[PDB]
Amino acid sequence: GLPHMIQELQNHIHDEGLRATSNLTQENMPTLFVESVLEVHGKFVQLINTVLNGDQHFMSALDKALTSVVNYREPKSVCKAPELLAKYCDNLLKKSAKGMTENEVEDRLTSFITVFKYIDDKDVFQKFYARMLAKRLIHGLSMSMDSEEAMINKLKQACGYEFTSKLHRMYTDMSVSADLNNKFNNFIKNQDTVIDLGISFQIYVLQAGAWPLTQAPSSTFAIPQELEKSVQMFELFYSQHFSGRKLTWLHYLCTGEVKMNYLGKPYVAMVTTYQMAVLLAFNNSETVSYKELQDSTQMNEKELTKTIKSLLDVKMINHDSEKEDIDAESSFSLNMNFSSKRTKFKITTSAVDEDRKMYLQAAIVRIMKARKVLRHNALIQEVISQSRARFNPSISMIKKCIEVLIDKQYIERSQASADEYSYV
Amino acid sequence: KQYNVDYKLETYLKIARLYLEDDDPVQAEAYINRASLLQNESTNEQLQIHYKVCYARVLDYRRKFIEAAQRYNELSYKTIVHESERLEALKHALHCTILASAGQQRSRMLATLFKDERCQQLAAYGILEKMYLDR
Amino acid sequence: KKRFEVKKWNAVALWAWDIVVDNCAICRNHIMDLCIECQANQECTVAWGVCNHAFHFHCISRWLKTRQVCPLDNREWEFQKY
Amino acid sequence: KGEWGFKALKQMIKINFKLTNFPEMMNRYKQLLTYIRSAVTRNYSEKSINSILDYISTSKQMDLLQEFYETTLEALKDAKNDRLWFKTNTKLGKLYLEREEYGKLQKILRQLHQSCQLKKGTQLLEIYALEIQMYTAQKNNKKLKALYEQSLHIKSAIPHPLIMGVIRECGGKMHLREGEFEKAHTDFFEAFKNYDESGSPRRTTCLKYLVLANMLMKSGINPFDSQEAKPYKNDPEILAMTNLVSAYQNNDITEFEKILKTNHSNIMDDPFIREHIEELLRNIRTQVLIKLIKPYTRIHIPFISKELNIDVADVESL
Amino acid sequence: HDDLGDHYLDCGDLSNALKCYSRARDYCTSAKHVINMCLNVIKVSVYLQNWSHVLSYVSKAESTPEIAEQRGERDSQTQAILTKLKCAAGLAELAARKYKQAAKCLLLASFDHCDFPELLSPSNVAIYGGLCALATFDRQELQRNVISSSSFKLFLELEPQVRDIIFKFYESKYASCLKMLDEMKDNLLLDMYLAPHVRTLYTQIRNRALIQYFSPYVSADMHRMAAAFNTTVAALEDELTQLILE
Numbered sequence A: 001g002l003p004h005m006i007q008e009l010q011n012h013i014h015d016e017g018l019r020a021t022s023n024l025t026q027e028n029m030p031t032l033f034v035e036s037v038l039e040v041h042g043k044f045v046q047l048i049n050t051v052l053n054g055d056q057h058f059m060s061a062l063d064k065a066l067t068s069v070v071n072y073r074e075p076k077s078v079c080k081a082p083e084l085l086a087k088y089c090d091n092l093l094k095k096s097a098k099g100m101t102e103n104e105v106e107d108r109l110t111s112f113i114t115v116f117k118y119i120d121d122k123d124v125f126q127k128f129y130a131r132m133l134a135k136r137l138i139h140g141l142s143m144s145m146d147s148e149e150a151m152i153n154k155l156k157q158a159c160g161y162e163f164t165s166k167l168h169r170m171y172t173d174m175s176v177s178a179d180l181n182n183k184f185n186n187f188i189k190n191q192d193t194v195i196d197l198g199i200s201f202q203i204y205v206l207q208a209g210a211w212p213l214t215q216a217p218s219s220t221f222a223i224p225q226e227l228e229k230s231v232q233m234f235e236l237f238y239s240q241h242f243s244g245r246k247l248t249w250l251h252y253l254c255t256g257e258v259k260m261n262y263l264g265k266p267y268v269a270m271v272t273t274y275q276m277a278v279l280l281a282f283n284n285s286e287t288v289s290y291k292e293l294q295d296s297t298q299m300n301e302k303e304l305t306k307t308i309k310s311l312l313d314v315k316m317i318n319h320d321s322e323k324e325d326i327d328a329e330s331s332f333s334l335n336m337n338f339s340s341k342r343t344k345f346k347i348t349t350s351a352v353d354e355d356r357k358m359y360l361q362a363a364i365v366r367i368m369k370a371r372k373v374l375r376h377n378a379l380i381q382e383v384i385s386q387s388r389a390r391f392n393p394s395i396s397m398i399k400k401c402i403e404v405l406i407d408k409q410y411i412e413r414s415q416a417s418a419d420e421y422s423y424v
Numbered sequence B: 001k002q003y004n005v006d007y008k009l010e011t012y013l014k015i016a017r018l019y020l021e022d023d024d025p026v027q028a029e030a031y032i033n034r035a036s037l038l039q040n041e042s043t044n045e046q047l048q049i050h051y052k053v054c055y056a057r058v059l060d061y062r063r064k065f066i067e068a069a070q071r072y073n074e075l076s077y078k079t080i081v082h083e084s085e086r087l088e089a090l091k092h093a094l095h096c097t098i099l100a101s102a103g104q105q106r107s108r109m110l111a112t113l114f115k116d117e118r119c120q121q122l123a124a125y126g127i128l129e130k131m132y133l134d135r
Numbered sequence C: 001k002k003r004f005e006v007k008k009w010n011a012v013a014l015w016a017w018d019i020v021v022d023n024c025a026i027c028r029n030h031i032m033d034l035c036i037e038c039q040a041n042q043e044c045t046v047a048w049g050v051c052n053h054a055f056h057f058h059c060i061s062r063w064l065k066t067r068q069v070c071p072l073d074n075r076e077w078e079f080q081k082y
Numbered sequence D: 001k002g003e004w005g006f007k008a009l010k011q012m013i014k015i016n017f018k019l020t021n022f023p024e025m026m027n028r029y030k031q032l033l034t035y036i037r038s039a040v041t042r043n044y045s046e047k048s049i050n051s052i053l054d055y056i057s058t059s060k061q062m063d064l065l066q067e068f069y070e071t072t073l074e075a076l077k078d079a080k081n082d083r084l085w086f087k088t089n090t091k092l093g094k095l096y097l098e099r100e101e102y103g104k105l106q107k108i109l110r111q112l113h114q115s116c117q118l119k120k121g122t123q124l125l126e127i128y129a130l131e132i133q134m135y136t137a138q139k140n141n142k143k144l145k146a147l148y149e150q151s152l153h154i155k156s157a158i159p160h161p162l163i164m165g166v167i168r169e170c171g172g173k174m175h176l177r178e179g180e181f182e183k184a185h186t187d188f189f190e191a192f193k194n195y196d197e198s199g200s201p202r203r204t205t206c207l208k209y210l211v212l213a214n215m216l217m218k219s220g221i222n223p224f225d226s227q228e229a230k231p232y233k234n235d236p237e238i239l240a241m242t243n244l245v246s247a248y249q250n251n252d253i254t255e256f257e258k259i260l261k262t263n264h265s266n267i268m269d270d271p272f273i274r275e276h277i278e279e280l281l282r283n284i285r286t287q288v289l290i291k292l293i294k295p296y297t298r299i300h301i302p303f304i305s306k307e308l309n310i311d312v313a314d315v316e317s318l
Numbered sequence E: 001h002d003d004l005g006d007h008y009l010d011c012g013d014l015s016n017a018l019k020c021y022s023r024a025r026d027y028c029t030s031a032k033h034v035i036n037m038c039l040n041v042i043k044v045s046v047y048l049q050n051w052s053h054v055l056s057y058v059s060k061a062e063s064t065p066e067i068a069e070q071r072g073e074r075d076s077q078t079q080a081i082l083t084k085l086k087c088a089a090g091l092a093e094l095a096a097r098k099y100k101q102a103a104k105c106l107l108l109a110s111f112d113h114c115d116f117p118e119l120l121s122p123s124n125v126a127i128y129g130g131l132c133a134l135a136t137f138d139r140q141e142l143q144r145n146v147i148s149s150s151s152f153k154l155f156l157e158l159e160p161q162v163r164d165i166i167f168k169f170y171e172s173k174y175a176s177c178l179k180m181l182d183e184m185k186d187n188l189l190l191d192m193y194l195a196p197h198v199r200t201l202y203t204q205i206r207n208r209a210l211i212q213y214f215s216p217y218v219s220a221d222m223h224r225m226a227a228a229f230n231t232t233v234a235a236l237e238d239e240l241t242q243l244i245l246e
Ligand SMILES: [Zn+2]
Pocket: C024, C025, C026, C027, C028, C029, C035, C036, C055, C056, C059, C060
């Protein structure tokens, strides 16, 4: 009776969702997906609120159907939905030129939080959003700090403080970087001896643990000699200001301006430090060899070839013939005759997993039968102590297994306290 | 510069050893604490043996006699080192156990050293056997 | 002064603690030691929190059976990393 | 115009400021402000202006700065006063407190909410921290407690780690005064974490208070065992506190009393440690007494007096 | 009804007031009006010195809103009614020879919400909350409800004598505590709502002190005990004989 119609309407909703989400263009797919799911959810919630005075079971089945459909896993393919939603967030929060007032963005985000709540795989979306927010903050592509703070607050309300723990630290790092720069300027200005850096220095000091950026590459990039005084002075300032910390300069994320003024006044170019070391090495003569760049910039082969290719895209330097492949000559040369047109020239662009999941689920079930009641921390500790024999567990995987067993009616959350589990 | 783990481990062990020869147990322990964080990721067996020897020496210097005795005893079970080095590690373990505070841990260490058949060659086997028998 | 000078440099750097963890706050032994409990009578590893405080797994297990907070920052304890 | 054009205009602004000519300076500044607001998006130009007025403006020019601040405050109320008004208010109002800004804040607060009948957590916490600082300067303990409990209601804010330092330090101080050492410890730890993350002067004051709170809650766990507090363990202003903890934990009366006597004019001078030190030298004495009488079934009171350095009457009272 | 109540308050007639209240009790529509009328009837019952009606109305008021709003809502921000009813209940229980419950339900008062000087002044409120707690509360709950309570600190500094009495009694000091109790007894007897209940309370306090004085001892000197209790050895011996007998 009741379960039969509940099940049949659940399949009806699921098929309606698939039909709505199918036959969509691959270019604007995030926006269409978000809008379609939002309109379906709004229509269904209106239909169930206007009729029969709630009937909680109907929207419970609707939420279950949405949760099942959003985690639509293709054979061997990962769930693309969290990445899609993260890209939608990044596009909404970026500085588009088509209006996009702050109030409308906030309304869109607070409406989007509903479809966000169904992800159930929120760690992939969290990592994607963290990476894209880091890029946006570093490159200054955020249209408003208020919108980013509002989005982080909405995410915190949706899930919790622990979910938005690193993003809060990134936001505070951006907030305090300006104060750090002002204090560094005061420190160099108030020194007993005059300090002339020769460079207008602005830095973004970020938490290593909070930010996804890391010195994962083994690049041996030699520092340019002109801006070594800046790094030495800032290291001294940081040592005098914050005790017990160390600095690891991300040389692949720092940019800067090189000005040409005696070659016909061709305005100023803006390039990364990787693209600046080679230009500085070009000061010896118009033509240089790969050996000279290797000995000067001391960069790895991959990074150096990437820099050379990017320079060729700029047409800053060129090869006379088609001998730019892997060889020993690599006789690059300047192309000053191809002068710039603008001024800014702002260029900026598993079997083991399944085995571990099954082991964790079996361990959780066995422990829950052993105790018949436990707390979250005690359950996690017991699971770790039991499964440490084969592998080191990940807390995210343990929590996912706990959630999937709660859904499977193996264990239940206590009515009095939500952190207590009981075996059923 | 991002040095390799072996270079940092070797430099830390050298600094700890130099501070030990300077009779500076606190700085030796400070620079062995850094080495202990890198010893678990290095693959050099010689580096691990040197770190274990230096850690045992630091613990012995800090008058952590029972811990240094256990470290020396487990270092005397390593087949990589020479026979003389293993015997010296066993002798140091025996000396630290004799110098340790009387208790359950010290009694168990004394029993373990007595069960070893190589403790007879050490010059303190009589003291070891008299302390093992609660005499 | 030069032929192709540099005007501005927007640096990006990551700051981290020189020494993150060197001793469990509960057992007072080093974080790579045997937690003082496994030392006297015996796998001992590190168990981090949401505050990234890195106590011994056994020491924090014994602490959690009496107190629900982190020993250092006195905030609600949540497991992370192992 | 453009970037080079605006930079040239700023150079001319500097040049005209060099030769004073005050009326021209004011009307030029007003026209610049109006043009900037009416044409270009504020955010980036405003942070650039904020960075501009700190490198040259700090050198004396007190009356000119007062006039400029007055004119900016008067001419910025008409459009919006949210970007830089908070920081200039905190900077200028620390010393004077001329009793006027609070009045209009109270008037607008009464006007805004009750008349109409949190999405504003960050600015609410900022104004709460400003009120907390002013009331701390005025020594209003009850108002500080009320402000702390009122700010505790905000759970959707992302503030600067200096606001969260001020309010958490106020909470720790009020918890210390009331006697809740467990809450004071975590409040002071949070305040010190925020102050260390951003700041410098008010950093080795919440660490001392956190040390005192940790020692006042039966101790256990060294405060200088976390990442944040460890580098400042050997700080000249924290050496006394870390020695006090090293003596308190692993209790020994001699070391504690020697550190107290040596730093007679260093630690126990502010009314926060000097008031709470009498609770110490009693908890550590109690722990020493407990450890001493553990293996005994009958013990002489004069023996305990000799061991604890206190006389017979104090031993009996303890 | 409001004018009738005001006239009855300023006139003093109570029988017709009781008749009007009985007639109007059946007409209740809003909880707030019931609250005001319950407070008024509590005041008139206090004036009449009839505590059974006070207890019945207090119990009705507590049991009406789903067992006092279950566990408990956000603490008193501007609703000073709860402190007023707690103070009235404390006065009623104290006047009913029930000191322990009076202290229990009187200690839960706030200075910011005790600004009505028409039922019980802060000075005598602190006096009652100190004396009853000293006489009836054990050491643990006296520590956790008086010395540890920060809200009662304001009341204690309002009347420094009671604060000193409690602090000296708690810290095993009885000569000074009993001397100051005797000194303040004369002022306590001139009071209105405490005097008939003072003497017994005092004896209780003394007895408590006596017991506490022997709590940490297995052999005690009678001379030092008598000196600590401001009495001769013979009187102390008689008092301890009576205490041992019961
Ligand atoms: Zn430990």
